[PDB]
Structures are given as structure tokens and as C-alpha cells.
Amino acid sequence: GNLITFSP
Amino acid sequence: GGNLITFSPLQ
Amino acid sequence: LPIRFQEHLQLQNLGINPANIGFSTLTMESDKFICIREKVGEQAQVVIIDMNDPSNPIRRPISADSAIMNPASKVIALKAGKTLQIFNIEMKSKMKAHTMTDDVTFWKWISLNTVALVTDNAVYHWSMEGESQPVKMFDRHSSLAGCQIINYRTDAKQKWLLLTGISAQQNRVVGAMQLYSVDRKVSQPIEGHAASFAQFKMEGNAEESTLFCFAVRGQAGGKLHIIEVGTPPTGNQPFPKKAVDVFFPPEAQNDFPVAMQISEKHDVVFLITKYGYIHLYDLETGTCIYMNRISGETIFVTAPHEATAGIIGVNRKGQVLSVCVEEENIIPYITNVLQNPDLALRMAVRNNLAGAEELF
Ligand SMILES: [Cl-]
Ligand code: NA
């Protein structure tokens, strides 16, 4: 999604 | 009614 | 200890059948009440435990598949498939009723006036205000299809909505979350087990940041994320995103996070795992403060512990237990046990506690 980025 | 709970009478 | 641990109640002492002490039959929407559904024949009852008067529970006959007390008032929400009813227990009166088009698979109070409804396809908010009916908030993401729904929660402003489900895959429990932005009208699927929102004011910011905190175990380790959601208020520094390990000992191979609550007073994350470990994390830095097994049995339901700004929960054995920061001990523990004077000083200034000054 476009909402948050984080370490998979 | 068709109530999902019943209560004791008030007296 | 940096925590105070308190057993409040053993529900079996009140004559509660331990078979009904589990996720589907016992609810604790706030620290004020516990409701337990018990069914022997076709004669279902609800046991209503007033946590300020635990020796005198109310037992009433029911025909509901689910019972959740309002967080603030002795007002019970009962459902049977599509049928929702709300009763004021003290007035013995039905105050609201609504029939949904679809089976409500999960529901929870998200405030003192709003119930969240989850169907197979959508999430609704149902306000108790006047002739308000359920309003659809979003469509469910295909990534949660076939999940058991275990949680729904929001930020303070109800602008950020989070639906959580789990499923069994390869003998592990995989968490699936849907984060929905109300303003952007967009969803993001996330592999996550337990989560909470929090309001956090950073040093030098005029306004609070809205934080999203989630914990997950993947195939090869656990992680905790603390992320600012939405555009930071004008003139606010953004919250630098935090990502930290969630430790599972080698002996806890099937363990995973099952509960999170965040202290508004102490800015600490409480994480509880299935095997019954509690973890304390600093909301600001994500630093792991404390870890310990507090329960041999799964704590399957939790709520804010209002009086201590802590976490209160029920385990499958019927133990009602609470954890909060021990304000007398936390700064000495971080200094002397963690050897982290930096974290000690930062946390001492945040809550105006003594003992963070480096003596030499
Ligand atoms: Cl009412
Ligand atoms: Na869970």
C-alpha cells in the first residue's frame, strides 16, 4: 500500500 | 420482544 | 522489577466453567466489566462481572452468539448472526436494535459511544447517538480473506483504522492486518500479529504525532514497528520510524504476539505473547525495557488498566492479571540492569521521576 513503508 | 437477554421482574 | 504485576481475580472462584474462559465466550472491553457466555443445553446465560464488586456477578439468560459491555457504562451489546441489540442493564431496557445485511463475525467498542462491526466484506462504525445506524468505513482487503478476525482499533481521531486477523499456515499462526486511511480512502495490507495507535508529543514539536505500533513474528524472527501515520502537523518534525527485534527464546518456537496496549502516561508499549511473555518497549526509541513470562496460559483479551495506565488481561485458566510501570523502580532498573543512563534520563524527564541524574 501507499500508506506506510517499513522493513519487511 | 425477541430480546437476546431477559431480566428478572421489577416486582 | 520495572513492572508491578497484580492478580485481580480467578474467575473459577466465582463458579465460572473453565471451558468458557476463551476468546469466543469471554470479553473485557474495558477494565470495568468481564462478560462470559456459558451454554449447557440450549440454555445460554451471560455472567456479568462488575470488577468493582466481583463476588456478586449477574447471571442472565441469553440467546446471543456474542456479548460486549460498553467501556464506560453498564450497557451491553448482544448479537445473533445479523441481529444487534443494546440493553441498559440497570433499566432492564432495550435501548437500540439493528439488523445487518451480512453476518457480523467480529465486533468491539472503539469508544464510549461507537461499536465497530466486521462482516466478511466490510467494517462499519455504529454510533449510539440518536437514530444513527451503522456507517460502512471501508471494504475488507482480500489479504485478510479466510482469517479469524481477532482485533479492530483506531487512532484517537478515528482517521486511521486497523483490522487484524490470523490463520494457521505450515503449523505457524500468520497475522494479516488492514490499515485504512479515512482521508486518503486507501488500504495497506501488513503481516502483523498485534498493534495499537498512540498519541506521542516529540521534544520541541508543538503538536502530538499519531503513531502506529505493530509487532509480528515472521518465519525467521520477530519485529516491532513504531511509525508516524499521516502528514506531520505544520512545523512538526516527523517521528523517525523505529524497527526493533522481538525476542523469542529457542524453546518458544510456536510463540507469537497476541496483545498490545500503550501507556498514554508512560509512553511504553505492553506486548503479550501466546506462551504468556510480557515485553515493555519505549514508545519513543523502541528500546526493549523488560521481558518476563507472567502467565503459563495465553492472555487472550486485554484492555487499558485506567487507574495505573497499564494493561489488564484474562488468561485461559481464568486469571485476571494486570501489568503497569512501577514508577518507583523503572528508572533504577534502566540505569542499573539495562546500563542505559540515556534511556533512564529521557524517561525520567517525560514522567517527572527521580533518580536519572548520573551521580559520577
Ligand atoms: Cl442507556
Ligand atoms: Na492472537
PDB file of N, CA and C in Angstrom, chain A, chain C residues 179 184 186 188 190 223 225 241:
ATOM      1  N   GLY A   1       0.841  -1.232   0.000  1.00  0.00           N
ATOM      2  CA  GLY A   1       0.000   0.000   0.000  1.00  0.00           C
ATOM      3  C   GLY A   1       0.857   1.256   0.000  1.00  0.00           C
ATOM      4  N   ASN A   2       0.231   2.418  -0.217  1.00  0.00           N
ATOM      5  CA  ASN A   2       0.903   3.743  -0.304  1.00  0.00           C
ATOM      6  C   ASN A   2       0.978   4.407   1.089  1.00  0.00           C
ATOM      7  N   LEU A   3       0.515   3.758   2.174  1.00  0.00           N
ATOM      8  CA  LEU A   3       0.213   4.454   3.465  1.00  0.00           C
ATOM      9  C   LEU A   3       1.480   4.587   4.310  1.00  0.00           C
ATOM     10  N   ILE A   4       2.216   3.487   4.480  1.00  0.00           N
ATOM     11  CA  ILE A   4       3.495   3.424   5.251  1.00  0.00           C
ATOM     12  C   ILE A   4       4.512   2.526   4.529  1.00  0.00           C
ATOM     13  N   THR A   5       5.793   2.822   4.743  1.00  0.00           N
ATOM     14  CA  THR A   5       6.955   1.991   4.333  1.00  0.00           C
ATOM     15  C   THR A   5       7.680   1.522   5.599  1.00  0.00           C
ATOM     16  N   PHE A   6       8.166   0.285   5.599  1.00  0.00           N
ATOM     17  CA  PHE A   6       8.809  -0.362   6.768  1.00  0.00           C
ATOM     18  C   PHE A   6       9.552  -1.608   6.298  1.00  0.00           C
ATOM     19  N   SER A   7      10.437  -2.107   7.172  1.00  0.00           N
ATOM     20  CA  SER A   7      11.268  -3.267   6.886  1.00  0.00           C
ATOM     21  C   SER A   7      10.435  -4.548   6.843  1.00  0.00           C
ATOM     22  N   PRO A   8      10.317  -5.232   5.680  1.00  0.00           N
ATOM     23  CA  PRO A   8       9.567  -6.490   5.589  1.00  0.00           C
ATOM     24  C   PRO A   8      10.077  -7.584   6.546  1.00  0.00           C
TER      25      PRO A   8
ATOM     26  N   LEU C 179      -4.580  -1.685   7.405  1.00  0.00           N
ATOM     27  CA  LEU C 179      -4.574  -0.250   7.775  1.00  0.00           C
ATOM     28  C   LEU C 179      -5.364   0.523   6.711  1.00  0.00           C
ATOM     29  N   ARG C 184      -7.514   9.555   2.994  1.00  0.00           N
ATOM     30  CA  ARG C 184      -6.936   9.140   1.688  1.00  0.00           C
ATOM     31  C   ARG C 184      -7.858   8.124   1.012  1.00  0.00           C
ATOM     32  N   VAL C 186      -7.654   4.884   1.248  1.00  0.00           N
ATOM     33  CA  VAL C 186      -6.743   3.807   0.746  1.00  0.00           C
ATOM     34  C   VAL C 186      -6.439   2.818   1.882  1.00  0.00           C
ATOM     35  N   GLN C 188      -3.753  -0.482   3.192  1.00  0.00           N
ATOM     36  CA  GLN C 188      -2.432  -1.143   3.029  1.00  0.00           C
ATOM     37  C   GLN C 188      -2.443  -2.440   3.826  1.00  0.00           C
ATOM     38  N   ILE C 190      -0.716  -5.571   5.719  1.00  0.00           N
ATOM     39  CA  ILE C 190       0.512  -5.670   6.550  1.00  0.00           C
ATOM     40  C   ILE C 190       0.524  -7.057   7.192  1.00  0.00           C
ATOM     41  N   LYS C 223       9.592  -8.742  14.889  1.00  0.00           N
ATOM     42  CA  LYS C 223       9.898  -7.304  14.711  1.00  0.00           C
ATOM     43  C   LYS C 223       8.758  -6.446  15.286  1.00  0.00           C
ATOM     44  N   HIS C 225       7.427  -2.400  15.036  1.00  0.00           N
ATOM     45  CA  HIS C 225       7.481  -1.161  14.229  1.00  0.00           C
ATOM     46  C   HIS C 225       6.715  -0.069  14.964  1.00  0.00           C
ATOM     47  N   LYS C 241      10.924   6.691  12.001  1.00  0.00           N
ATOM     48  CA  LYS C 241      10.339   5.330  12.109  1.00  0.00           C
ATOM     49  C   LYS C 241      11.306   4.462  12.929  1.00  0.00           C
TER      50      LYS C 241
END
